[PDB]
Amino acid sequence: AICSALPTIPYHKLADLRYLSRGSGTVSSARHADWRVQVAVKHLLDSERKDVLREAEILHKARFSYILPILGICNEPEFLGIVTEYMPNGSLNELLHRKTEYPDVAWPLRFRILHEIALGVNYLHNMTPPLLHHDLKTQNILLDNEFHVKIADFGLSKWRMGGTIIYMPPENYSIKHDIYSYAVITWEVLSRKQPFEDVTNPLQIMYSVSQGHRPVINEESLPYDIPHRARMISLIESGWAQNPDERPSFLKCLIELEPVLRTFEEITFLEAVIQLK
């Protein structure tokens, strides 16, 4: 009964428009001339038009604390795009793998990111009807100014009625896809390693995965000093199980993570972030 409409932003209101990246399309940064804030813009064909509008509708409907906030839609004959909040700290991929820029990523912050990814996905799954992301990667887990999570890219997302394959369950070559992706992300967050490092061809990964092989769990990838190592390994191994029926719900995953997050005092999250600056 209470309906909020997504604003239409005239393209001419986006000042200092600059290229960022390219992929479910091109990302550019800008400032809104009237709102005085920094924004991000994700931008001829008719079928491609419906796709951008579909994504915008999904982001607008799926608004929550751990979902990338949509500010409006650019819907002009000359230009079509999605306006969102600008995320100054990039993606989780950049945080994990830029080891020169980030020598230390403290455990409290790693656990908080993992908790917020699960909170964000759980919300999507609890919607009516449930929304299934179906394209979770470290690349589309964005980080705001204080390194809080914002889930982006709802291009492959589906209402319950390409690129990299390392986050894709073997049966995809389902309400149990996002958990598989999450298990791989957890492994990657705790190891700062690229899954299947020794693999030349992505087909060799697809073959290994279909045979039940997974990123390695040993002392080298996951050192014995990782807080709650046993519990995290259990979560990872259940999450990426060959049998989808054996993978947990996000609820179960969240009930598992809540006692872990309670072991960290609030100031340790602040200290982890200042260490990155």
Ligand X SMILES: CC(C)(C)S(=O)(=O)c1cc2c(Nc3ccc4scnc4c3)ncnc2cc1OCCO
Nearest to 143 by CA among 215, 213, 91, 103: 91
> Which of helix, strand or coil describes residue 80?
strand
Site string for ligand X, 183-202 (x = CB under 6 A): --------------------
Our finding on whether 251 is near a copy of itself (CB under 8 A) is yes
Binding test (CB under 6 A) with ligand X, winner from 14, 40, 114, 190: 40
The residues in 32-61 that bind a copy of itself, with binding defined as CB under 8 A, are: 34-37, 53, 56-57, 60-61
Cα-based distances in Å from 195 to 164, 191, 201, 210, 246? 11, 9, 13, 15, 22
Binding test (CB under 8 A) with a copy of itself, winner from 16, 48, 76, 146: 146
Binding test (CB under 8 A) with a copy of itself, winner from 29, 122, 164, 194: 122
273 vs 258: CA distance, rounded Å: 21
The residues in 168-227 that bind a copy of itself, with binding defined as CB under 8 A, are: none
Nearest to 161 by CA among 185, 138, 131: 131
Selection from ligand X, a copy of itself, none that 273 binds (CB < 5 to 8 A by kind) is a copy of itself
Our finding on whether 16 is near a copy of itself (CB under 8 A) is no
Other C-beta atoms lying within 10 Å of the C-beta of residue 72: 21
CB of 21 to ligand X, least distance (A): 3
Residue closer to a copy of itself by CB (options 84, 140) is 84
Binding test (CB under 6 A) with ligand X, winner from 6, 9, 30, 42: 42
Residue closer to ligand X by CB (options 91, 181) is 91
Selection from ligand X, a copy of itself, none that 27 binds (CB < 5 to 8 A by kind) is ligand X
Q: Does 135 qualify as catalytic in the annotation?
A: yes
Our finding on whether 152 is near ligand X (CB under 6 A) is yes
Other C-beta atoms lying within 10 Å of the C-beta of residue 108: 21
Residue type, 273: V
192 and 221 Cβ atoms separated by less than 8 Å: no
Handedness of CA 265, 117, 128, 250 (dihedral sign): negative
Our finding on whether 6 is near a copy of itself (CB under 8 A) is yes
Site string for ligand X, 75-114 (x = CB under 6 A): -------x-x-xxx-xx--x--------------------
Residue closer to a copy of itself by CB (options 53, 216) is 53
Helix (H) or strand (E) holding 78: none
Our finding on whether 145 is near ligand X (CB under 6 A) is no
Nearest to 150 by CA among 42, 64, 23, 234: 64
Residue type, 113: I
CB of 232 to a copy of itself, least distance (A): 18
CB of 243 to ligand X, least distance (A): 32
176 and 169 Cβ atoms separated by less than 8 Å: yes
CA geometry: angle at 132 spanning 126 and 135, to 5°?
140
8 vs 37: CA distance, rounded Å: 16
Tell whether 238 is in a known binding site: no
User: Where in the sequence numbering do the catalytic residues fall?
Assistant: 135
- Residues belonging to the binding site are 20-27, 42
